[PDB]
Design a protein around this motif. Sequence first.
Motif, PDB file in Angstrom:
ATOM      1  N   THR A 199       0.811  -1.214   0.000  1.00 13.97           N
ATOM      2  CA  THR A 199       0.000   0.000   0.000  1.00 13.97           C
ATOM      3  C   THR A 199       0.858   1.284   0.000  1.00 13.97           C
ATOM      4  O   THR A 199       1.807   1.380   0.746  1.00 13.97           O
ATOM      5  N   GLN A 200       0.540   2.226  -0.883  1.00 15.13           N
ATOM      6  CA  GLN A 200       1.171   3.534  -0.921  1.00 15.13           C
ATOM      7  C   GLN A 200       2.608   3.537  -1.424  1.00 15.13           C
ATOM      8  O   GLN A 200       3.258   4.538  -1.327  1.00 15.13           O
ATOM      9  N   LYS A 201       3.134   2.441  -1.937  1.00 14.54           N
ATOM     10  CA  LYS A 201       4.575   2.369  -2.222  1.00 14.54           C
ATOM     11  C   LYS A 201       4.731   2.695  -3.635  1.00 14.54           C
ATOM     12  O   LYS A 201       3.816   2.398  -4.412  1.00 14.54           O
ATOM     13  N   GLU A 202       5.835   3.352  -3.983  1.00 15.76           N
ATOM     14  CA  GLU A 202       6.010   3.750  -5.374  1.00 15.76           C
ATOM     15  C   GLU A 202       7.042   2.865  -6.077  1.00 15.76           C
ATOM     16  O   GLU A 202       7.196   2.933  -7.281  1.00 15.76           O
ATOM     17  N   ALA A 203       7.783   2.068  -5.314  1.00 18.42           N
ATOM     18  CA  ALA A 203       8.729   1.149  -5.910  1.00 18.42           C
ATOM     19  C   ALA A 203       8.893  -0.051  -5.009  1.00 18.42           C
ATOM     20  O   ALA A 203       8.841   0.096  -3.788  1.00 18.42           O
ATOM     21  N   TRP A 204       9.012  -1.245  -5.605  1.00 14.12           N
ATOM     22  CA  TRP A 204       9.313  -2.473  -4.871  1.00 14.12           C
ATOM     23  C   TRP A 204       9.599  -3.570  -5.892  1.00 14.12           C
ATOM     24  O   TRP A 204       9.201  -3.442  -7.072  1.00 14.12           O
ATOM     25  N   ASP A 205      10.277  -4.628  -5.432  1.00 10.47           N
ATOM     26  CA  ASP A 205      10.404  -5.890  -6.159  1.00 10.47           C
ATOM     27  C   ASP A 205       9.907  -7.017  -5.261  1.00 10.47           C
ATOM     28  O   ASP A 205      10.241  -7.057  -4.094  1.00 10.47           O
ATOM     29  N   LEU A 206       9.188  -7.970  -5.821  1.00 11.79           N
ATOM     30  CA  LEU A 206       8.731  -9.110  -5.064  1.00 11.79           C
ATOM     31  C   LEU A 206       8.830 -10.397  -5.833  1.00 11.79           C
ATOM     32  O   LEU A 206       8.621 -10.417  -7.020  1.00 11.79           O
ATOM     33  N   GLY A 207       9.131 -11.496  -5.141  1.00  8.87           N
ATOM     34  CA  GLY A 207       9.071 -12.770  -5.823  1.00  8.87           C
ATOM     35  C   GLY A 207       9.724 -13.835  -5.000  1.00  8.87           C
ATOM     36  O   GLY A 207       9.595 -13.861  -3.734  1.00  8.87           O
ATOM     37  N   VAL A 208      10.454 -14.695  -5.692  1.00  5.97           N
ATOM     38  CA  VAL A 208      11.248 -15.705  -5.006  1.00  5.97           C
ATOM     39  C   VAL A 208      12.565 -15.782  -5.604  1.00  5.97           C
ATOM     40  O   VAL A 208      12.747 -15.382  -6.728  1.00  5.97           O
ATOM     41  N   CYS A 209      13.507 -16.453  -4.922  1.00  6.28           N
ATOM     42  CA  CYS A 209      14.774 -16.520  -5.585  1.00  6.28           C
ATOM     43  C   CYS A 209      15.575 -17.670  -5.023  1.00  6.28           C
ATOM     44  O   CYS A 209      15.184 -18.239  -4.011  1.00  6.28           O
ATOM     45  N   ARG A 210      16.639 -18.057  -5.726  1.00  2.00           N
ATOM     46  CA  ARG A 210      17.449 -19.197  -5.268  1.00  2.00           C
ATOM     47  C   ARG A 210      18.154 -18.855  -3.992  1.00  2.00           C
ATOM     48  O   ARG A 210      18.546 -17.713  -3.787  1.00  2.00           O
ATOM     49  N   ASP A 211      18.426 -19.846  -3.163  1.00  6.13           N
ATOM     50  CA  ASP A 211      19.272 -19.594  -1.991  1.00  6.13           C
ATOM     51  C   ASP A 211      20.640 -19.083  -2.456  1.00  6.13           C
ATOM     52  O   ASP A 211      21.349 -18.357  -1.737  1.00  6.13           O
ATOM     53  N   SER A 212      21.069 -19.497  -3.642  1.00  4.75           N
ATOM     54  CA  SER A 212      22.460 -19.228  -4.005  1.00  4.75           C
ATOM     55  C   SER A 212      22.631 -17.937  -4.786  1.00  4.75           C
ATOM     56  O   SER A 212      23.651 -17.722  -5.337  1.00  4.75           O
ATOM     57  N   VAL A 213      21.627 -17.071  -4.842  1.00 10.32           N
ATOM     58  CA  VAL A 213      21.800 -15.839  -5.586  1.00 10.32           C
ATOM     59  C   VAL A 213      22.872 -14.952  -4.990  1.00 10.32           C
ATOM     60  O   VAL A 213      23.161 -14.962  -3.781  1.00 10.32           O
ATOM     61  N   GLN A 214      23.431 -14.183  -5.902  1.00  2.93           N
ATOM     62  CA  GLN A 214      24.406 -13.131  -5.597  1.00  2.93           C
ATOM     63  C   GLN A 214      23.865 -12.117  -4.629  1.00  2.93           C
ATOM     64  O   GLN A 214      22.782 -11.722  -4.760  1.00  2.93           O
ATOM     65  N   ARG A 215      24.666 -11.724  -3.660  1.00  2.00           N
ATOM     66  CA  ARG A 215      24.317 -10.768  -2.594  1.00  2.00           C
ATOM     67  C   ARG A 215      25.040  -9.425  -2.732  1.00  2.00           C
ATOM     68  O   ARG A 215      24.503  -8.391  -2.334  1.00  2.00           O
ATOM     69  N   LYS A 216      26.265  -9.435  -3.249  1.00  2.00           N
ATOM     70  CA  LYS A 216      27.133  -8.226  -3.243  1.00  2.00           C
ATOM     71  C   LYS A 216      27.259  -7.622  -4.629  1.00  2.00           C
ATOM     72  O   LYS A 216      27.171  -8.330  -5.633  1.00  2.00           O
ATOM     73  N   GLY A 217      27.510  -6.322  -4.686  1.00  2.00           N
ATOM     74  CA  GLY A 217      27.734  -5.678  -5.952  1.00  2.00           C
ATOM     75  C   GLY A 217      26.471  -5.514  -6.781  1.00  2.00           C
ATOM     76  O   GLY A 217      25.354  -5.600  -6.296  1.00  2.00           O
ATOM     77  N   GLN A 218      26.677  -5.314  -8.052  1.00  2.00           N
ATOM     78  CA  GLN A 218      25.619  -4.868  -8.949  1.00  2.00           C
ATOM     79  C   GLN A 218      25.118  -6.090  -9.659  1.00  2.00           C
ATOM     80  O   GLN A 218      25.931  -6.870 -10.128  1.00  2.00           O
ATOM     81  N   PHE A 219      23.806  -6.263  -9.776  1.00  3.62           N
ATOM     82  CA  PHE A 219      23.269  -7.410 -10.541  1.00  3.62           C
ATOM     83  C   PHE A 219      21.834  -7.105 -10.928  1.00  3.62           C
ATOM     84  O   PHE A 219      21.177  -6.218 -10.341  1.00  3.62           O
TER      85      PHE A 219
END
Lengths: 180, 180, 208, 208
Positions: free
Chosen positions: A65-85
């Motif tokens: 509610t009221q948010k102008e930006a967000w991402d939602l979903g699911v993802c692998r345990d092994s996804v990248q955490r650091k830097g740009q992606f």
Amino acid sequence: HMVHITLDRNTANSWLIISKDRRQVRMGDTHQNVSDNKERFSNYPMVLGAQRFSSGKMYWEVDVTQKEAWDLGVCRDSVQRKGQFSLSPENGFWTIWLWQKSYEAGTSPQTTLHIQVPPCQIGIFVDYEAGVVSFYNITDHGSLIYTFSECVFAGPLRPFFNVGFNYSGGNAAPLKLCPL
Amino acid sequence: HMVHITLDRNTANSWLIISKDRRQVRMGDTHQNVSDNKERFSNYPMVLGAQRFSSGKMYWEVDVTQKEAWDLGVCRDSVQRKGQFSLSPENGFWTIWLWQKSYEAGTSPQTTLHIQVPPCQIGIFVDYEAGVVSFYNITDHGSLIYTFSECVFAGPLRPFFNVGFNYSGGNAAPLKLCPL
Amino acid sequence: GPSVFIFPPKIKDVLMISLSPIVTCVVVDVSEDDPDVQISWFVNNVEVHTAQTQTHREDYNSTLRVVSALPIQHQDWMSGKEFKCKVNNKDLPAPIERTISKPKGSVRAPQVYVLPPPEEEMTKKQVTLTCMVTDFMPEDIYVEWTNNGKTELNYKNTEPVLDSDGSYFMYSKLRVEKKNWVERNSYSCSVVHEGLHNHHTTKSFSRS
Amino acid sequence: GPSVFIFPPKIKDVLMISLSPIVTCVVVDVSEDDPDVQISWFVNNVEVHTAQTQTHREDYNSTLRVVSALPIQHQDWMSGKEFKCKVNNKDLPAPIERTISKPKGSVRAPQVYVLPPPEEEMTKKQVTLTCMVTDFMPEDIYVEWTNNGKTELNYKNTEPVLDSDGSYFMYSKLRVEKKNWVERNSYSCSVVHEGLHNHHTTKSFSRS
Ligand SMILES: *[C@@H]1O[C@H](CO)[C@@H](O[C@@H]2O[C@H](CO)[C@@H](O[C@@H]3O[C@H](CO[C@H]4O[C@H](CO)[C@@H](O)[C@H](O)[C@@H]4O[C@@H]4O[C@H](CO)[C@@H](O[C@@H]5O[C@H](CO)[C@H](O)[C@H](O)[C@H]5O)[C@H](O)[C@H]4NC(C)=O)[C@@H](O)[C@H](O)[C@@H]3O)[C@H](O)[C@H]2NC(C)=O)[C@H](O)[C@H]1NC(C)=O
Ligand SMILES: *[C@@H]1O[C@H](CO)[C@@H](O[C@@H]2O[C@H](CO)[C@@H](O[C@@H]3O[C@H](CO[C@H]4O[C@H](CO)[C@@H](O)[C@H](O)[C@@H]4O[C@@H]4O[C@H](CO)[C@@H](O[C@@H]5O[C@H](CO)[C@H](O)[C@H](O)[C@H]5O)[C@H](O)[C@H]4NC(C)=O)[C@@H](O)[C@H](O)[C@@H]3O)[C@H](O)[C@H]2NC(C)=O)[C@H](O)[C@H]1NC(C)=O
């Protein structure tokens, strides 16, 4: 197939403020004084759910509610955490998002979503065995927004969240994991 | 197979100064007060020989002593006169040149010539029926410089000359059609 | 005598959460007789006291140059706050103020394309990859190259150009060893612009 | 008050035999009280009297601006002659002189390449052709596009960039209708630079 999702603090970008019950998260105005570690998304206001699934059907809801930006979903345990992606199935993320007055699916390149009734809450459905992630508009009677099919999960999945930057001031509202 | 070449005034860029015997040409410092017409090369210091060949073997020599830039060869009667263009067999010119301390053949792209003894005079040989234009170094005992073969003359040929611009001051010397 | 110029922060320092955007006031033509310059900073007219003001560098003209750098909040730049520096000095018949803010404008994310080398270059020692970034507003943008996360040394960007539909474009050129462009290898153009989802996109490719 | 800037002619006006290269002195900050400005021109210290000096245009700041344009000889620019303008005006405690000449330097002709559109664009209304011009010294250069001798309206050049080997590069972008890029059609990038044989080269192509 509702499931009770809580956020994993250890994964949270260090600027996020997560409620005590770990059911809400908001972007703070300052670095937040939590210790660094390898799990924690460095560059974006993202956070994972504590839960990990490797089979079955899972469903959960998120209040935007009221948010102008967000991402939602699911993802692998092994996804990248650091830097740009980028969020794409190649990189282990099956997501949709709201960015600058458009709704997109995180395919590559991204796919324009056609949503008649802007949602205040979204339902995320994963069917591990069928290789399916689908998104639903709860504000609009649960109508379908987007279905990823033939997914290659290639491991354990985690609920995925991006609260959005709030450099603008128009996106302070939190994401809330919804009253089951 | 020597042939007596004279220059066709009517074809000369209007800045060129052509001797009375029409056997020499030099780049003048000013527009030269000759009337415009459709034959006259507009953009470059070029000029054609009066002669036109459609068969046989023809040979002539040109003195380039002290010159820092020039183009020499033969070309179709029907070549372009106005505006910007490149010298290449596609456009109807079989030429070689001296430009900024290199010798090049006017192929496209251009071909680097390997000349041991810089020439003060060049011999041009056309064999119409064999489809050949060759260039010879007279200073160096007539050694070969360059041979265009399988040429598609596609019409009458004219001896072709570019005196070179002389914006630098180092290229005032004229081209001379050589004492047969 | 003296004159003041104000400069925005780099768009990348603003968009990237870990970096530190700075606004800069530069006072030139400070005479060596009257070296002391007092510089006051304000955010939306609220005075702040955090600027690093650097030992008034010396310059050829035989003048001094005063550089004062105010670190700012990411949110303050993007929200359109006004940053003002106020400059006092004996030779000024009255203080000089300069103001700057991020202007409102449309925001259009760039399209990003990578172009392979031109054919004739395919036989040279180095080849040249081209990143073409078009259609973006406002003009502030950051572009660089990498190859598997190693950021490349030898690329050069052009400055942005106002295109005819009122958007901006630019090009970025990367010189690489021909050898590389063949065997395996990946090259990526990364672009940072405020119109892009999560601020960034990278376009990739290699040996076709 | 008043200040003087001197500007070179366009490299294309110098190289092209029929065009007219001009050197320009611009005097700004001429006060409306003291509008009369006397401008003297010299070529290698030899005074000349041929300059068009334009009715001291009016400017916002409430100042006048004086623009004086000296037409010159092609040979004089390329031979390294010195062009000097000398400026007198009541408010000047003494005359202002500015000098300019073509600097010596290496001359390296550019390599010119045309790149076809990027793949994804192949399905858009317009496509974009790119001319890439590299390796040239000095930086002065002129680039435009045509298609069978019709000079194109809708192209934009970047400014030149100092590359890392000390040479210059630039890019030129042409937007055309997709329709065109398919059926027949020819597009050409024309470059004018002093290092090029007869001053010019054009690179061509179309639908592959
Ligand atoms: C006596 O000599 C003095 C020097 O001889 C003369 O000083 C010059 O006076 C000119 C006015 O007559 C000034 O002209 C102005 O210049 C403005 C552009 O200046 C920028 O670019 C030029 C080069 O293009 C550069 O020389 C300047 O240093 C300045 O560079 C910018 O500097 C800012 C602040 O430092 C940078 O921004 C910051 O960057 C940091 C990181 O580095 C952080 O990112 C910060 O967040 C960020 O804010 C910026 O990146 C940098 N840009 C570049 C390209 O380097 C122009 O806008 C004005 O319109 C005007 O034309 C001239 O600047 C000045 N030169 C110097 C060196 O001081 C003096 O006038 C003369 N006296 C007399 C009487 O003639
Ligand atoms: C009160 O207001 C005045 C205006 O407000 C202020 O005037 C300004 O003063 C500045 C100094 O503080 C001047 O800065 C200098 O600018 C130089 C660059 O100037 C050129 O480019 C700028 C835009 O980038 C442009 O605005 C200028 O008009 C100038 O443009 C060039 O003009 C020349 C000569 O006309 C052109 O060259 C000729 O072109 C013709 C064809 O058009 C032929 O081809 C000729 O052969 C050729 O010679 C040239 O093409 C053109 N270039 C462009 C890009 O347009 C810069 O080098 C200096 O380093 C310096 O920074 C500023 O120029 C000036 N502006 C104007 C419009 O007068 C005044 O200072 C202010 N007073 C006070 C007290 O602050």
